């Protein structure tokens, strides 16, 4: 359960950060995430994909 967010220029988060709807993911401000959850940043698939989650 997650949503994919492809990128082009690097990323602003590591693997496991806590995001929120409307936060800056990668691409220096282009691609933003609309949902909560830890962000699992992948290199090969070039995706900042965020899994629905709540840091509890």
């Amino acid at each position: 359960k997650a949503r994919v967010y492809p990128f082009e220029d690097d990323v602003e988060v590591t693997t496991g950060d806590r995001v929120a709807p409307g936060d800056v993911l990668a691409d220096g401000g282009k691609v933003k995430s609309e949902i909560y959850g830890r962000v699992e940043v992948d290199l090969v698939r070039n995706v900042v994909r965020v899994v629905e989650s709540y840091d509890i």
Partner: protein, 345 residues
């Protein structure tokens, strides 16, 4: 329940076949070399940023917050390393994730082989550790065999791990079991000897002797070297061990206290401390106050002849004769009063 606990915790996570295994090891080594790669980025040691990965991985605030009152705090010696390499181009910022995923994969492969480590410590029981202990230290041996493993050699990690688990366990034995600290080699030789004994017992159809058992041990092995260390080997004895056959008696309650002087000694000693004071007053103001300085009676520390002669203005010779004569001159009073003639032990 702690017993079932770990078993049901590791039984939750599955094992790893060749695919996952080889992959995981490759991930780990890639993260390692990625660290070495970034070790030249800002000039930080390969071990430094390595643990800096832990700060956001296997706990946020819990890894460096309490390794004692002092360690490498999050704000001070950590944060300036977390937000330092944080601004570097692609060709650098990628190795960050390589290290993230490598570092995670490490722990992963460990968890995968945990279902082995436990099944390993199963043979090593009886060491003064009921399972869970043995398993814990074994897990440490796994952690070792992990960072030292090489997938490239096409070896099954189950082989490499075992040799290290058996190590971290057989090591933990000597550093735990005997209440009295017994150094590694000591226990090593112990097991060697006891092995020979427990072996030739059935061979000869009876127990050996310090001469014949040490004989098959090697050079310099006499009755002594075996019987001597045999004592050392023996652990202490629980003071709760019941004495006799009746349920009352305790072991510890059967031990005296000679640590503190008995009342009879309080008076025995306080008596001499006085009786020697009254039988002393028959000495000249010199040969008395000086006769105390040589016995450590004055300042409690003994004052050698050299210093005494400096205190009275006399010479290293005069005080010498002073003591002699002053002393026997008291011997006359003793042999005539019989007041102190006791205390001859």
């Amino acid at each position: 329940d702690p017993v079932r606990q770990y078993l049901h915790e590791i039984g939750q996570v599955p094992l790893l076949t060749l695919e996952e295994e080889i992959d995981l090891a490759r991930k780990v080594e890639e993260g390692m070399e990625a660290i070495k790669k970034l070790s030249e980025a800002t000039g930080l040691d390969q071990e430094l940023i390595r643990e800096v990965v832990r700060a956001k991985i296997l706990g946020t605030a819990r890894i460096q917050k309490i390794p004692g009152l002092k360690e490498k705090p999050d704000p001070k010696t950590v944060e300036e390393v977390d937000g330092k390499l944080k601004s570097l181009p692609k060709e650098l910022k990628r190795y960050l994730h390589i290290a993230r995923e490598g570092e995670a994969a490490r722990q992963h492969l460990i968890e995968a082989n945990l279902r082995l480590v436990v099944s390993i410590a199963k043979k090593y029981t009886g060491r003064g550790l009921s399972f869970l202990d043995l398993i814990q230290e074994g897990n440490q041996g796994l952690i070792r065999a992990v960072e030292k493993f090489e997938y490239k050699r096409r070896f099954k990690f189950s082989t490499y791990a075992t040799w290290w688990i058996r190590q971290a366990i057989n090591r933990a034995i000597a550093d735990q079991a005997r209440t009295i600290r017994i150094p590694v080699h000591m226990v090593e030789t112990i097991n060697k000897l006891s092995r020979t004994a427990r072996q030739l017992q059935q061979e000869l159809g009876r127990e050996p002797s310090y001469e014949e058992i040490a004989e098959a041990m090697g050079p310099g092995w006499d009755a002594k070297r075996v019987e001597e260390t045999l004592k050392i080997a023996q652990e202490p004895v629980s003071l709760e061990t019941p004495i006799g056959d009746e349920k009352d008696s305790f072991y510890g309650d059967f031990i005296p206290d000679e640590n503190l002087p008995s009342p009879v000694e309080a008076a025995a000693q306080s008596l001499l401390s006085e009786e020697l004071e009254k039988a002393l007053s028959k000495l000249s103001e010199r040969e008395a106050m000086v006769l105390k300085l040589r016995k450590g009676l004055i300042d409690g520390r003994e004052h050698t002849l050299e210093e005494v002669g400096a205190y009275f203005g006399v010479t290293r010779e005069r005080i010498r004769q002073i003591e002699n004569k002053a002393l026997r001159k008291l011997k006359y009073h003793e042999s005539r009063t019989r007041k102190l003639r006791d205390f001859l032990e």
